[PDB]
Design a protein around this ligand. Structure first.
Ligand SMILES: Nc1nc2c(ncn2[C@@H]2O[C@H](COP(=O)(O)OP(=O)(O)CP(=O)(O)O)[C@@H](O)[C@H]2O)c(=O)[nH]1
Ligand SMILES: [Mg+2]
Length: 367
């Protein structure tokens, strides 16, 4: 299933939210948690779709050669607990009734087979922009339900290009740039600036665009793809050390599936093992290899999401404490437990509120 430790779907991460969500409910606070979006941005063919799908943990995004992603795909992960011929014709070994996808343009239809989700993304793409590299900003809206995911939104985007191809107009570059800016200009979006390691970092569209909207690198993570394709003897060590174009949140090198791996339908599990072995055996990456590969990028995102969840505790702690002192000061006047029917009931109301607020304050402390 989609539960994977260390990433955006870490089981402890989901449990933390549910515990805080009950705290918010006990105190009467609409959900204040506001998780950021995760957006891949970079030059065309840099491997953006592969990176984004690895964060989800299950394949569902079209990947390959040429111009592939030609419309924004806004994926909204939605947490839903558990409640067959519906999975009889499934070609996805990991299909289960607790996890499925829903497209906005196909209401009522559920996709338990993630290979069929990918097929529909490609189908819906061609239905709107054809089969000759046409691009459109109209997003494909996808909802994926699972008991193991957060209420998080991830965005796949077309890559920025230089020369129009096929049906693309002369100003396609500005159109794609403006398309991407819509999704990363928002203050909370986490920008995954994806650059292929087999091209000099100074040519990175992702880094240029990310630095325009996030000059201080408060929400930009560098992703260096295709490390396995670098010229023999060259490496990205100087980049990881912060010597070329420093990023506050740093860079993460990854090795995703090549085109032959795609044609052979190599499972993601075998691809992650091959990535791990690559860095552990490379003379330049054996050192601190735990900070290389897809698992480490998921750790950075996991920690950032923890930051935004915990970012709400201050206001909640102050609200619980101040509210607790208000009711305790009312219990002080009513006095210890013949008496007015109002006084007996108000004392009970205040007592119950104290017990609820005390139970809430301790839960926030144990986090
Ligand atoms: N060797 C190798 N190939 C990779 C790696 N990442 C992606 N590729 C290959 O590069 C190509 C691009 O993959 P993809 O994830 O679709 O890239 P993209 O950035 O989304 C393409 P688009 O800009 O058109 O949306 C594919 O052939 C894929 O197999 C990597 O780390 N190593
Ligand atoms: Mg893509």
């Amino acid at each position: 299933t989609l539960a994977q430790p260390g990433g955006i779907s870490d089981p402890n991460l989901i449990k933390l939210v549910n515990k805080l969500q009950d705290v918010f409910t006990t105190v009467g606070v609409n959900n204040p948690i506001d998780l950021p979006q995760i957006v891949v941005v970079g030059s065309q063919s840099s491997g953006k779709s592969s990176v984004l799908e690895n964060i989800v943990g299950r394949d569902f995004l079209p990947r390959g050669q040429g111009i592939v992603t030609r419309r924004p795909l806004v994926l909204q992960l939605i947490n839903r607990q558990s409640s067959d011929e519906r999975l009889a014709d499934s070609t996805d070994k990991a299909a289960n009734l607790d996890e499925w996808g829903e497209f906005l343009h196909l209401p009522g239809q559920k996709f338990y087979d993630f290979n069929k989700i990918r097929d529909e993304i490609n189908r819906e793409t061609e239905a709107k922009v054809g089969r000759n590299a046409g691009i459109s900003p109209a997003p494909i809206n996808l909802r994926i339900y699972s008991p193991h995911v957060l209420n998080l939104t991830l965005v796949d985007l077309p890559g920025l290009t230089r020369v129009p191809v096929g049906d693309q107009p002369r100003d396609i570059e500005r159109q794609i740039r403006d398309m991407i800016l819509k999704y990363i200009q928002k203050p909370n979006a986490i920008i995954l600036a994806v650059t292929a390691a087999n091209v000099d970092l100074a040519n990175s569209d992702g880094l240029k665009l990310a630095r325009e909207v996030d000059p201080e690198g408060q929400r930009t993570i560098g992703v260096l793809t295709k490390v396995d394709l670098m010229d023999e003897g060259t490496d990205v060590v100087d980049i990881l050390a912060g010597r070329i174009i420093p990023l506050r949140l740093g860079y993460v090198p990854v090795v995703n599936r090549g085109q032959r791996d795609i044609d052979n339908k190599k499972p993601i599990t075998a691809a992650l093992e091959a990535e791990k072995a690559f860095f552990e055996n490379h003379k330049a990456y054996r050192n601190k290899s735990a900070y290389c590969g897809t698992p480490y990028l998921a750790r950075k995102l996991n920690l950032i999401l923890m930051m935004h969840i915990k970012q709400t505790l201050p206001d909640i702690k102050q609200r619980i404490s101040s509210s607790l002192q208000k009711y305790q000061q009312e219990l002080e006047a009513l006095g210890p437990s013949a008496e007015s029917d109002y006084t007996v009931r108000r004392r009970k109301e205040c007592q119950q509120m104290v017990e609820s607020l005390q139970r809430a304050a301790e839960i926030v402390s144990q986090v």
